[PDB]
């Protein structure tokens, strides 16, 4: 049983670590979308492209 506990516990730490890295990528995109909405919708940006 201690092999199954070890494998499933290592599998679950693998999933949570992958989701932590994937969440940081999505947060970096949500900060860009909040910036785009503030400058482009609520204003008129002169920042090229």
């Amino acid at each position: 049983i201690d092999r199954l506990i070890t494998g499933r516990l290592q599998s679950l730490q693998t999933y949570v670590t992958q989701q932590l890295i994937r969440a940081a990528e999505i947060r970096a995109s949500a900060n860009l979308a909040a910036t785009k909405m503030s400058e482009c919708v609520l204003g008129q940006s002169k920042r090229v492209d």
Binding site: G7, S11, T14, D49
Partner: protein, 50 residues
């Protein structure tokens, strides 16, 4: 390239597949980074002779 080891490594299931898939995503992204920086121009503009 041992046979006997590979038949044990199979019993750990999807670990090896998702490592190859992770490094593949890292490798593909390096071309995207290079495209976004340099390929901002539609046509190859060329300087006059004078």
């Amino acid at each position: 390239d041992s046979t006997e080891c590979s038949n044990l490594l199979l019993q750990y299931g999807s670990f090896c597949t998702q490592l190859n898939r992770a490094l593949t995503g890292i490798a593909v992204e390096q071309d995207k980074n290079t495209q976004e920086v340099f390929a901002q121009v539609k046509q190859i503009y060329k300087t006059p002779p004078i």
